[PDB]
Amino acid sequence: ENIKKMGFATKAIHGGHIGDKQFGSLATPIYQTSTFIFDSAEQGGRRFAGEESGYIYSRLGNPTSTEVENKLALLEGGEAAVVAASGMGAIAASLWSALKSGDHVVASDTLYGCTFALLNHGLTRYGVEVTFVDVSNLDEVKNALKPNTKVVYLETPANPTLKVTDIRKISNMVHESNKECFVFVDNTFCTPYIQRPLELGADVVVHSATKYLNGHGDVIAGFAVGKEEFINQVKLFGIKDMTGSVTGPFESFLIIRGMKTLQLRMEKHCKNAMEVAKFLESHPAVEKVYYPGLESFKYYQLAREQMKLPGAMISFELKGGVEEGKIVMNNVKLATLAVSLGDSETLIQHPASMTHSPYTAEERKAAGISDGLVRLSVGLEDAEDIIDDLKQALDLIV
Amino acid sequence: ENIKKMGFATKAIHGGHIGDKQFGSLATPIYQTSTFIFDSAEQGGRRFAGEESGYIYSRLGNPTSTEVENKLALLEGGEAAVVAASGMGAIAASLWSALKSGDHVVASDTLYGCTFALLNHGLTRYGVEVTFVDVSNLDEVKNALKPNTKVVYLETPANPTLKVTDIRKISNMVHESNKECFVFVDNTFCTPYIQRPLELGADVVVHSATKYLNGHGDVIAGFAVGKEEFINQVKLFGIKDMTGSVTGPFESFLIIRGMKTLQLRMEKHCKNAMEVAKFLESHPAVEKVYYPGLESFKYYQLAREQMKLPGAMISFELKGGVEEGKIVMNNVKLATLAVSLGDSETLIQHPASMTHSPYTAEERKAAGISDGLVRLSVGLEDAEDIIDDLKQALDLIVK
Amino acid sequence: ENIKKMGFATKAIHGGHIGDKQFGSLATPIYQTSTFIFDSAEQGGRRFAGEESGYIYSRLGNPTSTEVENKLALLEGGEAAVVAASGMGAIAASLWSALKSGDHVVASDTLYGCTFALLNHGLTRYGVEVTFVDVSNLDEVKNALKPNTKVVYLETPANPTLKVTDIRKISNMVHESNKECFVFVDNTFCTPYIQRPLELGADVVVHSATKYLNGHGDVIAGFAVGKEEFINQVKLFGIKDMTGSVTGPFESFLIIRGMKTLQLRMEKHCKNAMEVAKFLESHPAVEKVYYPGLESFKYYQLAREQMKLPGAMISFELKGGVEEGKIVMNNVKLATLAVSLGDSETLIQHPASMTHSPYTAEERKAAGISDGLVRLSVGLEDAEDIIDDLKQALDLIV
Amino acid sequence: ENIKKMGFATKAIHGGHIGDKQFGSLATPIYQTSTFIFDSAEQGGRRFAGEESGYIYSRLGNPTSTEVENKLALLEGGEAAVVAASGMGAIAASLWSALKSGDHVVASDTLYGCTFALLNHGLTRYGVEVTFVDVSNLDEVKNALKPNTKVVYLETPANPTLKVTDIRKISNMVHESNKECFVFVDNTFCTPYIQRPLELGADVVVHSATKYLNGHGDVIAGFAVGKEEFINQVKLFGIKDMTGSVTGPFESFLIIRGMKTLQLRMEKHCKNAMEVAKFLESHPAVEKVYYPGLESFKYYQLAREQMKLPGAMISFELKGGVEEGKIVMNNVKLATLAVSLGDSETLIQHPASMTHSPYTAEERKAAGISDGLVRLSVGLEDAEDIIDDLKQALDLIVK
């Protein structure tokens, strides 16, 4: 099994799988254990010294987690991956390992709300300078770069607007002018099936596994993906010391299980979303549809440059404010009123009347997060059913 | 009911249990879910705006985790608790939530290794200043206090030799010297069954639930306990943003399950360890035994004031060095060669040839570790079997 | 949610889902509990009397299991379903509830090996008469029917030959002549996505959920599906008393999770199998391919009569005996040498050198289970990878 | 090691543990897998042909389940054991594996309800003949023996009133009267910590592990224990074909976890129940208490011969009837209204208004159930709290 030459599905299914060498179990065993047994004091000493392979203690590493790490690194085309007990855990642990007091970060002004809060209010308590910029005007990006800029943090498509960012072109410019700077890309919305930021110049990829990679709405987990040199530091410092964000081995087993169908779900998510997006664009209550697959969309061709599929997140604005948005939220029958995304169940959320949250009213005016903006996570249901349900709720405001 | 007034076991078994109101199931359901459903758009807005309690999303809170949080707070006598995905996660999230660049921490110079690394190499990287002190020398502690000291961090009994710290004296001291200073006490080795730092004047208690609280060697998890106001910031800042240290609902279920027998397990751990410590002190291969229950122990009296039982951790020094520790390790048959503790299986490590193998013999003497020190977590087995196994191993190094 | 009018995927995803009315959890909670609490002695007495709804004790019923039961009944078009701790558990419990000492069974002579053993050696220890017949010659079927025939048991397509059986036409004839007789159909190989035997005249459907319905090779479970009147007896007698085959609530949660992608997996299983079957039919080491989707296949048009898709099990005979079969089993690199079926991983098994098992050498001569017969469970991998691996192993015997 | 020679707790904790040979993990891995991989086509043929041990497919056997099977066999002193997906599953699979149409069973007339239903209404439907007897009257037992009697089925102590059966006398009798007869003893209420029927001459022991063996109210499971030769047929016939009663590897993991504290839990269950039984007998609302540890108990001496401890089940009759039982049930605040037993939470049921509500007052008198009988499973709470809660409930019916 020189797995790396094979298809995506084969890699998702068989990649990183070591095998139960003692009983021959087909399925990955759940090594639900806190600690590990040494055969000798010498073997222990050598595991602690780095001389020998093998396991010590589940905060430091666990066989079930190792497999899903190796599987995702393989899918992203990265040397190494670390799995964490949440997406924010993988992001924080990566940021802690890469930065120190006095370093500087350039971030996108359009981010997942808790990433913005981590950057805006968290890292800045601890001596890290942060500048939020429009990643669509590279001159703005290039002028934010200071001699001590260590991370450029980007998310594409961006939660909640689906704004797309030229990964190759920011990476090139940053790498030309700041040789010490990492380019981080949050690839949650895409998964490696749709977008592989490491092939476009990114140095570090982060995911909320809570979303598409697990895919079943029963796991909180994250990953960081990148060079072995740096991921090793994320494991031995960001996770071991700074965050203690240890994925439960049972949760790792569930991510492995969900990744068995990652190819099939992303294909179905996206075919559903494209039908839904076209419906929304033609409905009389809708003013603007935000979707990478619509030719009307501002970042359509940047999406076509980086994304195999337009994805399965849709945002749209109703004619009418928050009030018409609330009316739709409160009368869908198949769509589920919840945050998160990437589940079998279609999810709908209305930042304007709920999570407008970690941003101030002004700070999301800058990012383009209007009231009346609805965000839709298109599920795996039959598309006619999703559309019928959206249609009945939208007809209420016509 | 008056659950606060009941016995300890009644509290461990029944405390924090909200109940399954839809189907009445006896066991706490595993709410293995990432997200939650809102009844209206406005309900979700109220919950995100702090105007209303209720669930939103498991990184911010989960019903299974809430239950074990409520149960441990009740046992510690604290107002609130947060469970994290590891001991270090609960420690780091608490420290992050109380500190900022420009703050100062006073810490014991005798701590769990990874706690020490986080303090010495981690927080100092981010503008926090840390002074390490010998907590036995109260005058040396009061001297290290600065006006920006925001955390005094203690661990008692501590690694690797079970040094005990006078919780009430130092906190009484710290509190009248600086009104804004949190006193942290790591209470892993004791659990609330043996020691309750908050009633001794501590502000925040941290736990590695990986050890005795879960007690079954199948969970990595942590807790912090204290005032509702601070724990809310540990949840909404330290967990939500800074660490992402989210316990799996499954792991919280297992911790709940493990806590049903905490009273019973702590009693047996301590009964066994008292017998093992007596035997080790009388054995000819053994130079010194560190056990709070032995009247030879330097902090015997102070431990007898703070701890309901002398615990079940044991450190002892062999007459000998690395080669001696290696032989004992490589010949125990019931005890298990493994780091960690608080397990039903008796665990044993020899740091000089194992955990502290990478360091030099001199650096290991800077960490309190002789070449003959052995650390012992006494399990739930029959004491005669534990002792017999230790006896034949140690007899191999008697001259 | 009048769910029954919606698409298959929507039903698989949302069907049977009650909802967490206390905390609003999206995912089904795991009610991992032995017993349930009464609010009053009166409420207890009424639950035991049948007067009140609600739960008593997990052998009698469990909320997590109730949901996957209701979900599968909805997909099959049956009134009720019971989930069991194995496929054999659902089959035995159904058979125990329907039969008594002195009743008679007509069964197909081509069956899953342990079903044959249950019928041939198990029920006959306990006074049940059993006659094994060729379900392809209805005159043979009709002549086996005795006045005391109570079950006609059939499996289509049959493990291991994939022989197809006219469900509508046996059901009609049996129902005309033996008004007291149940028609059981094992629908494991198809799932309700491909075949709905209750719509063709069957009275009872059984599944090994261990295979496609769970789909992830980490669960042993079964179902019976049928009229409420009879399923209620299976629950209160077959499961409660005769087998004690109680699905663990955690396993039920895993089946629910696997059914979220049942539509997507069956589509992918079958498109893969059709490509593999055509490859096998053209390879010089292969003498005969057994696959419903091949026009060469004996039961092609009976398959087209009953099956939306030709399925994803393939059997084939090599030119050469067991010896060439073993050579292929021992040199595949991506296919996994294991029994079971319906997993993400392609599985290959060689009854001739392994499980030829519960049949005698003669009894499978009658059913058509030759040596040199290989059975293939086509997985979810990329088809080129599955075919490349089969090709290299088969080339060894050319 | 000489695990057979060690103490009980050492056996419960370490017994049957094969070990994770690939990674050395301390906890038993959850082998949550349906199927297994063969190294060659011929290896799979050897395993299906009984020529070779090893795994095939989880309905035939799973490594997590094997471990808990080995552990329980060791505790009972039996050769082998099979775990099933419920108590009834292990009972039914054993009975199926030993009987056939034309066989005869002698059973106690005082059994667990669903066991009785299976015997009286289930097996008789399939040509098996069943005679129910009073096992206290040895002459009535020997009289019901027939040449085709293949099972003598016992349960001691039994529902609902804790009748004790002389295991060694009846089995000694049965064995010299009929050489091919299996003696079954249901050992649920005791566990191997208290009673071991195989050393008293029984052939097969059955368990509902749902009760004390798991002990945490989150598993439905069963066991049968006995000679390797019979248990192999229970596995390869009774489980594989006749019942399909396959334990989830996850459930087996939980039973293993629960058994780490079995010794500790049985001690506390019994200490608490002895205090609860004394209090109940002295209480004015209580007519009679059925407890093996009370010298008033009809089978006190026989129980003292067979049982290491008097157990933790308690039946008692109220001075009163259905209306009295209802009031007590509807006013306990710590005890839980629920069927089942062997849980860390104290459980209580009043059969006349609850489990046996569907039957008439006369049929319930045919089942040993007065209108004032209450069944009590004493938990792991503090005894004062259990008693206080029972006291205020019972005081509501004192004249």
Ligand SMILES: *Cc1c(COP(=O)(O)O)cnc(C)c1O
């Ligand atoms: C939800 C989300 C996260 C947060 O990850 P968690 O698993 O919730 O900690 C991070 N990035 C993006 C783009 C998200 O949508």
Ligand SMILES: *Cc1c(COP(=O)(O)O)cnc(C)c1O
């Ligand atoms: C093991 C330990 C910790 C760390 O907890 P983890 O759960 O391993 O992250 C902290 N303090 C003490 C005393 C410990 O023993």
Ligand SMILES: *Cc1c(COP(=O)(O)O)cnc(C)c1O
């Ligand atoms: C594997 C199989 C079964 C047996 O079900 P289990 O889940 O293994 O008990 C029954 N029917 C068919 C067609 C099978 O392939």
Ligand SMILES: *Cc1c(COP(=O)(O)O)cnc(C)c1O
């Ligand atoms: C509960 C019980 C059983 C039945 O076991 P289940 O696991 O519920 O199927 C059998 N015998 C006794 C004594 C019991 O208490």
Ligand SMILES: [Cl-]
């Ligand atoms: Cl989100």
Ligand SMILES: [Cl-]
């Ligand atoms: Cl540790």
Ligand SMILES: [Cl-]
């Ligand atoms: Cl199979």
Ligand SMILES: [Cl-]
């Ligand atoms: Cl019961």
Ligand code: NA
């Ligand atoms: Na989902």
Ligand code: NA
């Ligand atoms: Na699979």
